[PDB]
Write a protein that binds this DNA or RNA. Structure first.
Ligand SMILES: [As]
Ligand SMILES: [As]
Ligand SMILES: [As]
Ligand SMILES: [As]
Ligand SMILES: [Zn+2]
Ligand SMILES: [Zn+2]
Ligand SMILES: [Zn+2]
Ligand SMILES: [Zn+2]
Lengths: 198, 198, 198, 198
DNA sequence: CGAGGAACATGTCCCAACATGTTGCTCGAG
DNA sequence: CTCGAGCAACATGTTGGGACATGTTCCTCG
């Protein structure tokens, strides 16, 4: 009631998410772990998420992205950037400095603040795949480390991506855990390799 | 001269309770012992209780939660927080500081005080399971240790969850014993392991 | 918030403190450890402190007793009783319920609350030793355990006894650490025996 | 482009600094390394510095304390608390939240902010040693870790203590390096033991 | 150069140990 | 036949510090 749904819902347009499978290096900047359904992303580093749909949705549909804290203790608290990072000037003009999740290189972006929950989100209108493509990509990037004292303060978060009509109705939903850190490469291996033993 | 009924009553909507109980660690924060029908919960730690129903109940139905002391000597006394804990500021805004049981992350919550019995309770309107889910979860948390001098003072309590219509009528009821303590992990094992011998 | 001096000062009247050396039992209620200069006292149990003086001081001299927290972190905070204990009715009429240190069986006692510091103290006029005695005794007792959640909260305290003239001047000062606990006997041995090793 | 002098100057009153030599434990909160002339202090932990003087200075003399960054690159920058720590409410009323160095339990304290340099300091009037004592102690505590992102940001600092007359003149000066950290014990040993090898 | 990957620096966490109040269990009295 | 005083045993919250977590620096090498 106070905490956005995290439930996967492919909807009637077959809304699914994809990620660029890389990892053949060690000095990696952004990577995805299908086992953990978790993305390992460096701070303020562009990372493509791609949208897949069986059918094309009607014009006026938008995709919003919103972080929530994963653990139940913290769910209720709003995910914002840390005092340090909001005050240091790194904006791209458009993005309010307090917002964690911004969208790179999309002029029709809007940064929003729900009047009831107070959560931040970032919405962009849906575009269908370009000709000769199977998916639309959004380039998000996250503007704090997970360990930022005063912000996420070492707590893991989820990123929920919804597909919504003009009127704000839900057409589909997906989610994935995110860890923003200095060494995605290292943190990637450690977590997957810790999983094998257990 | 009135203690609420503690009797299990699944009612005509098949009201039952479920718990995660996942554990598998030692540093556990919340766990459930089916053998003891008891929950072991840390102080102010979110712990999911989930509601199961054969049929969906009519709109306007609400679920209330209320603590009573388990032992017969004490049943009659009202379960409230200790002097220390009511006066220390830890409220979430909504929850009156004297109330033991609060509900995390539900905006339509109400904290009540029965004009006849004087017992506290916390009610939230019933929501059916989200699509592709079998149960509705509530996230309670308990705001004093069981051993709190001046409150429960080392006396065990029960938590009674009822399902009620708008008008206050009973549609179903369940209950489980609760121990709020610093070390749920330890206290869990001890009690189960003490049970085997006897 | 400035802190009363803790400095020993025997002054020009040779103000010293004495205690009844007992300990030949295990079920002890009040005992003194010269090594630690610490008293081990049960809650609300009368314990004699005795005053020794080389010279007799002028009429109108008073002795006040005041607790402060020992550690430097906490010195600044005023020592009061816990929420449980102030609200439970155990007063002897004279003693305000918030005051930690009271004096047994002295009708001319006064309980003071400094309008600037807010510290409590308990003053009684000085009487010289009775004929054929070498010291005057005061019977203090402490109205909370050291471990009282919401009060001293496991922090050790000092008790400062000053000898003051009518005009408020300092004539002498002494101090001793106090631990109020359920088992003085046990807590006595443990601390002395732990001192040897270190 | 004006950095306060760091030069030791014992002056005509023989102004020197002393520290409580402890360290017989591992879980240490505040310690001093004579070799390094450095103090290892936990965050917001009271730590005594003591003033020694051959002769007593005239009434109206004050002692001020001021942090500056040690390295030459950074000297020029003002030492303040981090964005997280200034905004979190932990004040004792008197201390402005941005000030790094505060003084515990002295009511005549003043927090100063130089209209030209913008440096912070904390001044308290000098008191001579209490009777039967060889030094006056001040209880400082530092309100950020050395590693605080957005504040000192892992850069070491110096603490300069001056002895000044009413009129603002210099009567004496001393200094010592400070590291505020979570584990003073560990960080103490590491640095002394690293010194041997080099 | 700097890209890469150690090693380093630095704050947290886990849980056995410890601390501390309470409830048995035992055995010599009124 | 009990009954209570005094310890052992238990109950329960807190601590201590080695192992982790996590960002930053710093040598090695195409
Ligand atoms: As990414
Ligand atoms: As729970
Ligand atoms: As005593
Ligand atoms: As210190
Ligand atoms: Zn940040
Ligand atoms: Zn409580
Ligand atoms: Zn108390
Ligand atoms: Zn800081």
């Amino acid at each position: 009631s106070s905490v956005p749904s995290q439930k996967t819902y492919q909807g009637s347009y077959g809304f699914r998410l994809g990620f660029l499978h890389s990892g053949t290096a060690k000095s990696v900047t952004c990577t995805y772990s299908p086992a953990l359904n978790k993305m390992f992303c460096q701070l303020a580093k562009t990372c493509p998420v791609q949208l897949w749909v069986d059918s094309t949705p009607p014009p006026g549909t938008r995709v919003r992205a919103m972080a929530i804290y994963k653990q139940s203790q913290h769910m209720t608290e709003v995910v914002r950037r840390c005092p340090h990072h909001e005050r240091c000037s790194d904006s791209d003009g458009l993005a309010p400095p307090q917002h964690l999740i911004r969208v790179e290189g999309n002029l029709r972006v809007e940064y929003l603040d729900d009047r009831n929950t107070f959560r931040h989100s970032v919405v962009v209108p849906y575009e269908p795949p370009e000709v000769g493509s199977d998916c639309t990509t959004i380039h998000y990037n996250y503007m704090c480390n997970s360990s930022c004292m005063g912000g996420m303060n070492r707590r893991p978060i989820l990123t929920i991506i919804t597909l919504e009509d003009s009127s704000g109705n839900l057409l589909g939903r997906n989610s994935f855990e995110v860890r923003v850190c200095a060494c995605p490469g290292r943190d990637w291996r450690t977590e997957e390799e810790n999983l094998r033993k257990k």
